[PDB]
Design a protein around this ligand. Structure first.
Ligand SMILES: Nc1ncnc2c1ncn2[C@@H]1O[C@H](COP(=O)(O)OP(=O)(O)OP(=O)(O)O)[C@@H](O)[C@H]1O
Ligand SMILES: Nc1ncnc2c1ncn2[C@@H]1O[C@H](COP(=O)(O)OP(=O)(O)OP(=O)(O)O)[C@@H](O)[C@H]1O
Ligand SMILES: Nc1ncnc2c1ncn2[C@@H]1O[C@H](COP(=O)(O)OP(=O)(O)O)[C@@H](O)[C@H]1O
Ligand SMILES: [Mg+2]
Ligand SMILES: [Mg+2]
Ligand SMILES: [Mg+2]
Lengths: 248, 84, 228, 236, 58, 415, 116, 398
């Protein structure tokens, strides 16, 4: 077999360890990101929601890297932690050097380069973490980016990773309007796609965390929605479903 | 088994007889329907070894390239015991 | 026994260098002849596509103005060794104000080659034919991945090494001239090549004592070729 | 049994991991490139992205420097690393010596960098093959995951390699590259010989003499495709 | 099927998660088949002996 | 989606009627009665009378066959186990009727007591079991068919590139026979066994065929399927009788083709394994060397997987010399090409050295296949002469087309 | 030939080819209406009590197997037997569903928190 | 000699359309079959010598006739014959027996009472071997194979052309290829090509599973293989097809596995029959296997197997040919554009195309239609094509 080491090419030219990490990403909790006019949001499922687990970080899946940037996380806990800390370090190094916020994409590439290293040099297991990036800069405005354990990245307008990622991406393909999507419509779409992707019914709010990014008077405020607004979002989704039931 | 018994009887008939059993792995293979007949032959041989006792002139030498295949019952005490 | 450069075999052989000679065997044929008049050096090009620029196939390289080299086997290892040879020639000229002897150039390349396992890598799977004039006259040397090297009056490397070597033994004597050496090399190359011999399937190089310049042949190849 | 390490020679002298590295290129989308008298053109099979995916980040034609660009085929992350290293090296060469980096020099550096990752164990070889086109004289070179570079009048690497090259050898004539439009049309036809969608999956970049890069918008490429179709309509 | 010119389908593979009615559907077919319904388990054709499973399949 | 509706009987009738029916019914009925008619002819002829040993009428023409049938009586074959010799006047004779039983009988008055020695086989009457006629000693039929008796047409000039192997073979199977005096003078006992091993198709069986072609002694091509018998211990008895027959002949030659079949490795961790095959192999081991010296029986053994053989069999007391057949060198491959292209209708300008160099790691069988493929290419386009290009295409089709996946872009790594 | 098996991807693609097997029929876990049909089918001989809404029972079984529905009916009957009655109540059905739907979690938050 | 027992086949009736030409050709077949029936029925009816010969010979030998094994020939009329119970008997050889036919080990017919040699049994063929012989040639012909021109040409040069035209081979000096292995992904046309060559060939054809040549008892495997190949020798021009050779052709290896060593012994006997001591003669062997890399090198080596014919997944032209052949009996509409099925990269094989056609027919029958349409084919493509799970990596490569 050609999967014992990360640096062994298969006879068909496939890095089996990298593909194993990519497939292992599916074990991670569902995290989704949607771009929209004047906004970009991430949503995530809390997964382990045991009653004896105190919720003290409030952001176990969403992290704030820069002033105008945020990232989701889906993968190994330790790899996610080190990747987020190193993302913050890269962003702060760029800010110190240039006295200007890092323009999103570069940051992604930066981290991605490092991930690529773990898929090339021997003795290091590939970073089994894939994460979404949301941000804003002076070049392309609001941007959403997708990363892979292999260090490959891509720009996106709506994409999800983790559990039931394929179903979420198909639903986003079906129910996304390029150009004419706002923050409210994006939040409703995220809520409905989370309800459909998460096997649990009624999509209890404390099992889902949503963080939005918006430009407000040149301050690029990054908000993490408290439980209270997720209650009313869930109620809104339920009442739209009840209204759609009227067809019968 | 008849062959083993007749060979041992012929060894008995001559006073100073030496039996030489080469390649004991064949019939000394551990038990586990030819296995039944091989067991009959080996147990007849074992009984022949258990037969004579008063330091009789009949003595037997067994040669083999394998000991793991050999039945441990063949070694025992009253049978082939000098592991040279 | 055949998995590392540090494992000896019951016969005492290193079953990794021999694999490097095997890697040599699937390169391309290279003939070299040393005569009292100079050194001639022929190689089959093995063109792969008309689109590919023939000048990109660097089977013949100039180590210096007086010494040229021919490779056989891996391009990467051969180019590394050729760059090493050029660097050593330049360093010897810098530190001694004299042209490095082709024997010393081959010595330096072999010294690099022997380090396949020395530190607490793999052999360079390439044979090198170093032709050139020095203070003692024209000389031809051959080096293999193990780093062993030897002066050869006429040596064949790469594929068809056995047949070309046999024919070279048949047709080589001590008092050959450069033109007849070129003719013998070309006829041997034609007889050991599956493709029809012409100006684009082979390349020629030569060095002379007083004519170190023109260490190549460009469109005068057909002149020797159609007078075969 | 001799393909689980990069420093082990096969009994017939084969570095099997190095050969396996080329399958990654064989799995990449077709990238074609030709050189003309005054231009160097290179088309890319731009496979359709997802509906919600932004194609700006998906770049296969990358400019190493203002006088030289590069299109890869193989693993995308290794390609990013190699392109970044090539840009850094070209800038460093311009720093050390005043004259700009030659396309031959940058190809030599890329080939050496790829080779130096195939000489040591515990270091996976780059799984990309590159086409580097530039002016110094229009020059086209192709690298290799092994670490060998070559000079070509015309290549195509990736998914369609044998087919596109087979089309190319009996299409690259002196009059074919006589006109810049003729060379771009030749590139378009060669890419269309493999990319069977037309226009929507074709991205051609042209660099003119002492000029800058210009990615062909999907209207100029559409016009050239229409012209090629009109020219081929002479069969009936 | 003869008039359509197609070949009659032969094999049907009932695949799915356990306890969904695969062999239940086989039992239902066997009840209404008016035809021979030779049944085979997945382990009856193994045997300890060489070529006996193939012979029994034949 | 919309569920599929059932197919009612009216629908079935319409689909099978609302269409082509002008000739469909007639065509189908004609085909059915054609099949029935074919069955009728096959049944009505249906004999194919089996051939039986019925001699031509003039050969027998014997009404006395019934006289032979009723007058002569059958006799069961049984070996006289022992002579009782009670008083040398009523001696008695213990006989063993194969597997039936053992008996104490007396001879019929036809035969003499001195003519019936102990241990020989005799015919006994079926009623009183009395000895009636002495018989020649048993010769197993399959053992006598194991002999060749027909030299193949493979000379030693048809095995190219194996000069060392041929010379070492003749040093063991030919030289110690034709000119033994060259050995006893030096006091050297020549090896009595040779194991031919190497890659498949390298020429082991070809060399064995050449040996049998110019043996001048008794050559026995042992069939590996007959030493493997259904009943327990029958393969060992097969080996015993084979070696006895070899000893009867003066300085016989035995060739155990494909010895891996009955030359495996002894084991017991498999809970029985073969046992019978292992017992046959052990008896062959005993016959080769040990007590009861084997004699002037030089043994040939060939296998293209020798690492699975029993170390006792591989021990150089049974298989003394171990001749290895390796992939031919360039000169050997040129010789093989010349040998296999000798009878072909090819050009005179074929550079066989080129073709030999184009097949680096190739056995002689691959060279023969290359020659045959060159002829096939010359036949496809109907040329009566096979040129060099045909041989190059054959080399590409046989060697390169199945060697490896090292494609030309991947083969650009070497220059 | 009718061939029934789980693990569709573990049998070799030599009997899976269309010539050997022309139809591959998938048996997904029953949907809500399919679960309702199965409940109606397996409760035909059970004496149900008015207020035995089987739609709500089908809701309480989110993605069962189909044999689990039969087990649910059997366990409701078992509760009725243990209470020595012959009728079956809605609460009986719901708690039988709860027993049959017994899920085994990791029970080790350390393991579950490996994958963030 | 015992020349080849070629399979019988009726002449192909074309066109396959339900027209009057097909009726006329089929009725011509019926006419000639009825002529044969009439002649063969009135032959023995008008039959009014050798009866004395039979009444003498059969009475002398009597019934039943035991079958024994000849062991020794003592005199010109006495032989030691072993009965099937293993008991040897010194019996007499009656006059009405060809003394040249008696050989040691031959099957001999003996009298029931005195066991005297009354005749010799010629065939004595294992029933597991005589069932391998093909009596009814398969209906598939070379016209039912789309594409595969190179493969068909190679197989014709190997097993077909030498029989019809040995002139080329004898003139140039080649020994024609006597071994072919048809290897490739399943459903590509290997067994179909075997059926086609069996239909076309005028030589006897033996079909083997590569697993029915394997027997319970210890030594019956290699013995059965030897019997099969000897039978192939008897009918001199012969073709021995061993489908799924993977069953026995697997690579040799060392393990205890008391049954596997018999497996390897059987395969060793097979390769001895293919190319070992003594020539093989004019018997060709066709072998088919999905996985060739798992076969033993000594089995697929040249000299034993001369040609390795690769059956790749069909390309666009080949797939179009398959669709044209397999919808020939269909009634296509005018809106059908088969091209959309031929294009795309579904990696569908010839068997896949056959199933697509069958499922399109079923789809048309669902809508009560006897003529298929483009929509039916499109539905059938997705309905049947769902075979592989992923088979591909992710978006790593650009
Ligand atoms: N040196 C040679 N010269 C000519 N022909 C050769 C040579 N070596 C092999 N051959 C050819 O190889 C063919 C088959 O080889 P052979 O029967 O000897 O196989 P083997 O190596 O004994 O294999 P196996 O493992 O099946 O016993 C022969 O018919 C012969 O034509
Ligand atoms: N090239 C083809 N032309 C026409 N029909 C084909 C072709 N390939 C396959 N088929 C059809 O597919 C059917 C099944 O294929 P076939 O029996 O030849 O399988 P195979 O290639 O031998 O596979 P396996 O590996 O299972 O033995 C054939 O009966 C035939 O109708
Ligand atoms: N659709 C269904 N309707 C009614 N009962 C079902 C259904 N599917 C499964 N069952 C029940 O499942 C039991 C057997 O399931 P089985 O067919 O063995 O599943 P599998 O074939 O997957 O092992 C039967 O007792 C049957 O009552
Ligand atoms: Mg079941
Ligand atoms: Mg052989
Ligand atoms: Mg088949």
């Amino acid at each position: 077999r050609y999967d014992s080491r990360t640096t062994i090419f298969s006879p068909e030219g496939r890095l089996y360890q990298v593909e194993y990490a990519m497939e292992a990403i599916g074990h991670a909790g569902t995290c989704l990101g949607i771009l929209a006019n004047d906004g970009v949001l991430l949503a995530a499922e809390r997964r382990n929601i045991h009653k004896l687990l105190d919720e003290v970080f409030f952001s176990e899946k969403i992290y704030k890297l820069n002033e105008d940037m945020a990232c989701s996380v889906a993968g190994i806990t330790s790899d996610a932690n080190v990747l987020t800390n190193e993302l913050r370090l890269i962003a702060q190094r760029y800010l110190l050097q240039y006295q200007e916020p890092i323009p999103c994409e570069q940051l992604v590439t930066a981290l991605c380069d490092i991930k690529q290293a773990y898929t090339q040099f021997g003795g290091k297991r590939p970073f089994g973490v894939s994460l979404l990036y949301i941000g804003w800069d002076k070049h392309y405005g609001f941007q959403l980016y997708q990363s892979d354990p292999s260090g490959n990245y891509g720009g996106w307008k709506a994409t999800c990773i983790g559990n039931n990622s394929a179903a979420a991406v198909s639903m986003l393909k079906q129910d996304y309007k390029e150009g004419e999507m706002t923050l409210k419509s994006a939040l409703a779409l995220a809520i409905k796609v989370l309800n459909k992707t998460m096997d649990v019914s009624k999509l209890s709010a404390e099992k889902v965390e949503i963080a939005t990014l918006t430009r407000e008077n040149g301050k690029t405020v990054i908000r993490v929605l408290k439980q209270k607004e997720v209650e009313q979002l869930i109620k809104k989704h339920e009442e739209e479903e009840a209204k759609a039931e009227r067809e019968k | 088994a008849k062959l083993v018994r007749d060979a041992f009887a012929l060894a008995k008939e001559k006073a100073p007889s030496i039996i030489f059993i080469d390649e004991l792995d064949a019939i000394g293979t551990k038990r586990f329907a030819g296995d039944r007949e091989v067991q009959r032959t080996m147990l007849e041989l074992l009984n022949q070894l258990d037969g004579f006792q008063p330091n009789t002139q009949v003595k037997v030498i067994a040669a083999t390239n394998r000991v793991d295949i050999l039945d441990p019952a063949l070694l025992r005490s009253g049978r082939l015991d000098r592991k040279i | 026994y055949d998995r590392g450069v540090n494992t000896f075999s019951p016969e005492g052989r290193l079953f990794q260098v021999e694999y490097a000679i095997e890697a040599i065997k699937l390169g391309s044929t290279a003939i070299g002849i040393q005569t009292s008049e100079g050194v001639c050096l022929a190689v089959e090009k093995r063109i792969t596509s008309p689109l590919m620029e023939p000048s990109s196939i660097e089977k013949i390289v100039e180590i210096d103005a007086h010494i040229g080299c021919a490779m056989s086997g891996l391009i990467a290892d051969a180019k590394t060794l050729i760059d090493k040879a050029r660097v050593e020639t330049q360093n010897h000229w810098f530190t001694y104000n004299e042209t490095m002897t082709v024997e010393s150039v081959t010595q330096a390349v072999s010294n690099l080659a022997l380090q396949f396992g020395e530190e607490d890598s793999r052999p360079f799977g390439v044979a090198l034919l170093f032709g050139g004039v020095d203070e003692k006259g024209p000389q031809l040397f051959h080096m293999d991945p193990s780093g062993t090297f030897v002066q050869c009056d006429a040596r064949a490397i790469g594929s068809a090494s056995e047949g070309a070597q046999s024919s070279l033994q048949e047709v080589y004597h001590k008092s050959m001239t450069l033109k007849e050496a070129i003719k013998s090399s070309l006829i041997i190359l034609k007889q050991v090549m599956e493709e029809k011999l012409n100006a684009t399937n082979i390349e020629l190089a030569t060095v002379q004592p007083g004519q170190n310049f023109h260490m190549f042949t460009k469109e005068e190849l057909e002149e020797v070729i159609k007078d075969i | 049994s001799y393909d689980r390490a990069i420093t082990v020679f096969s009994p017939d002298g084969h570095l099997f991991q190095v050969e396996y590295a080329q399958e990654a290129v064989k799995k990449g989308s077709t990238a074609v490139g030709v050189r003309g008298r005054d231009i160097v053109v290179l088309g890319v099979e731009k496979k359709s992205v997802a509906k919600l995916q932004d194609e700006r980040t998906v770049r296969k034609i990358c400019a190493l420097d203002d006088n030289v660009c590069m299109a890869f085929a193989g693993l995308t992350a290794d390609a990013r690393i190699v392109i970044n290293r090539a840009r850094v090296e070209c800038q460093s060469h311009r720093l050390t010596v005043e004259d700009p980096v030659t396309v031959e020099y940058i190809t030599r550096y890329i080939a050496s960098l790829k080779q130096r990752y195939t000489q040591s164990n515990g270091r996976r070889p780059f799984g990309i093959s590159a086409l580097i086109v530039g002016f110094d004289t229009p020059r086209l070179y192709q690298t290799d995951p092994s670490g060998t570079y070559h000079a070509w009048k015309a290549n195509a690497i990736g998914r369609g390699a044998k087919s596109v090259r087979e089309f190319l050898e009996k299409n690259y004539t002196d009059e074919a590259i006589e006109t810049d439009d003729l060379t771009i049309k030749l590139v378009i036809k060669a890419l269309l010989e493999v990319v069977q969608s037309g226009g929507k999956n074709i991205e051609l970049a042209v660099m003119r003499r002492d000029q800058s890069l210009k990615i062909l918008n999907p209207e100029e490429i559409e016009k050239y495709v229409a012209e090629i179709e009109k020219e081929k309509e002479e069969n009936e | 099927f003869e008039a359509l010119g197609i070949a009659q389908p032969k094999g049907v593979l009932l695949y799915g998660p356990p306890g969904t009615g695969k062999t239940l559907l086989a039992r239902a077919v066997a009840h209404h088949t008016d035809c021979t319904f030779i049944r085979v388990s997945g382990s009856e054709l193994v045997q300890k002996f060489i070529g006996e499973g193939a012979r029994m399949v034949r | 989606d919309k569920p599929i509706r059932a197919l009612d009987e009216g629908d079935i009738a319409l689909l099978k009627t609302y269409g082509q029916s002008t000739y469909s019914r007639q065509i189908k009925q004609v085909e059915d009665d054609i099949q029935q008619l074919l069955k009728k002819i096959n049944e009505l002829t249906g004999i194919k009378e089996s051939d039986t040993g019925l001699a031509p009428p003039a050969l027998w023409d014997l009404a006395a066959d019934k006289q032979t049938l009723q007058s002569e009586q059958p006799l069961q074959v049984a070996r006289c186990t022992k002579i009782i010799n009670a008083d040398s006047e009523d001696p008695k004779y213990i006989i063993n009727v194969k597997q039936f039983a053992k008996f104490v009988v007396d001879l019929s008055d036809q035969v003499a007591p001195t003519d019936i020695e102990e241990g020989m086989r005799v015919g006994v009457d079926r009623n009183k079991y009395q000895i009636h006629i002495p018989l020649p000693p048993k010769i197993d039929p399959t053992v006598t068919m194991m002999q060749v008796e027909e030299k193949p047409d493979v000379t030693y000039s048809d095995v190219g590139g194996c000069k060392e192997q041929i010379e070492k073979l003749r040093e063991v199977v030919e030289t110690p026979l034709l000119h033994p005096e060259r050995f006893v003078n030096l006091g050297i006992e020549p090896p009595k066994g040779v194991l031919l091993f190497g890659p498949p198709g390298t020429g082991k069986t070809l060399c064995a065929r050449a040996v049998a072609n110019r043996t001048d002694a008794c050559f026995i091509r042992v069939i590996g399927s007959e030493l493997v018998q259904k009943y327990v211990g029958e393969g060992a008895r097969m080996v015993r009788e084979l070696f006895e027959m070899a000893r009867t002949k003066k300085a016989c030659l035995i060739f155990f083709d494909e010895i891996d079949a009955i030359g495996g490795a002894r084991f017991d961790d498999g809970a029985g394994g073969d046992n019978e095959v292992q017992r046959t192999m052990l008896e062959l081991i005993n016959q080769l060397d040990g007590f009861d010296p084997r004699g002037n029986i030089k043994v040939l053994m060939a296998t293209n997987r020798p690492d699975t053989l029993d170390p006792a069999l591989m021990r150089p007391g049974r298989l003394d010399r171990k001749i290895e057949f390796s992939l031919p060198d360039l000169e050997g491959r040129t010789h093989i090409f010349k040998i296999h292209a000798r009878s072909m209708s090819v050009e005179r300008d074929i550079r066989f050295e080129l073709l030999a160099r184009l097949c680096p790691n190739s056995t002689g069988a691959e060279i023969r296949s290359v020659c045959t493929e060159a002829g096939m290419f010359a036949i496809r386009a109907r040329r009566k002469i096979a040129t060099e290009k045909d041989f190059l295409e054959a080399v590409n089709k046989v060697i390169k087309s199945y060697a490896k996946f090292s494609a030309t872009p991947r083969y650009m790594t070497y220059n | 030939v009718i061939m029934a098996t789980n693990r569709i991807d573990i049998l070799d693609s030599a009997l899976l080819r269309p010539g050997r097997i022309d139809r591959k029929i998938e048996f997904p876990p029953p949907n809500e209406e399919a679960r309702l049909d199965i409940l109606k089918i397996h409760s035909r001989k059970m004496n149900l009590t008015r207020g035995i809404n089987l739609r709500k029972i089908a809701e309480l079984m989110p993605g069962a197997s189909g044999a689990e529905v039969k087990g649910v009916c059997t366990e409701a009957g078992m509760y009725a037997l243990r209470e020595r009655r012959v009728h079956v109540t809605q609460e009986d059905f719901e708690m039988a569903v709860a027993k049959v739907m017994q899920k085994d979690s990791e029970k080790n938050m350390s393991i579950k928190k490996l994958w963030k | 000699t015992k020349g080849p027992d070629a399979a019988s086949k009726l002449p192909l009736v074309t066109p396959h359309t339900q027209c009057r030409l097909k009726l006329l050709k089929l009725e011509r077949i019926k006419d000639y079959l009825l002529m044969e029936e009439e002649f063969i029925r009135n032959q023995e009816q008008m039959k009014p010598k050798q009866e004395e010969e039979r009444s003498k010979v059969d009475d002398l030998r009597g019934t039943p006739m035991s079958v024994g094994t000849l062991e020794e020939i003592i005199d010109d009329n006495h032989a030691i014959v072993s009965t099937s119970v293993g008991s040897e008997h010194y019996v007499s050889i009656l006059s009405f027996v060809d003394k040249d036919l008696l050989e040691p080990g031959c099957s001999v017919l003996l009298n029931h009472k005195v066991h005297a040699v009354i005749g010799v049994l010629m065939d004595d063929t294992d029933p597991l071997v005589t069932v391998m012989k093909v009596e009814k040639a398969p209906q598939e012909t070379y016209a039912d194979i789309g594409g595969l021109d190179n493969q068909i040409q190679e197989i014709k040069e190997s097993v077909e052309l030498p029989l019809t035209h040995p002139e080329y081979y004898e003139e140039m000096g080649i020994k024609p290829p006597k071994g072919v292995i048809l290897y490739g992904p399943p459903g590509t046309g290997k067994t179909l090509l075997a059926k086609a060559v069996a239909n076309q060939t005028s030589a006897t054809f033996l079909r083997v599973v590569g697993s029915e040549l394997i027997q319970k008892y210890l030594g019956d495997g290699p013995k059965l293989v030897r019997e099969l190949f000897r039978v192939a020798e008897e009918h001199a021009p012969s073709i021995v097809f061993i489908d799924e050779i993977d069953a026995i052709g697997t690579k040799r290896y060392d393990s205890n596995s008391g049954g596997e060593r018999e497996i390897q012994r059987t395969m060793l006997e097979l390769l001895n029959q293919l190319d070992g001591f003594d020539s093989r003669g004019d018997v060709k062997v066709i072998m088919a296997t999905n996985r060739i890399e798992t076969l033993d090198p000594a089995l697929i080596r040249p000299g034993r197997i001369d040609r390795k014919i690769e059956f790749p997944l069909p390309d666009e032209k080949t797939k179009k040919r398959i669709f044209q052949i397999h919808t020939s009996r269909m009634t296509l509409a005018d809106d059908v554009t088969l091209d959309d099925l031929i294009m795309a990269k579904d990696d569908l094989s010839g068997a896949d195309i056959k199933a697509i056609c069958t499922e399109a027919g079923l789809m048309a029958l669902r809508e009560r239609r006897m003529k298929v349409t483009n929509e039916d084919f499109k539905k059938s493509k997705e309905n049947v094509l769902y075979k592989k799970q992923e088979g591909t990596p992710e978006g790593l490569y650009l």
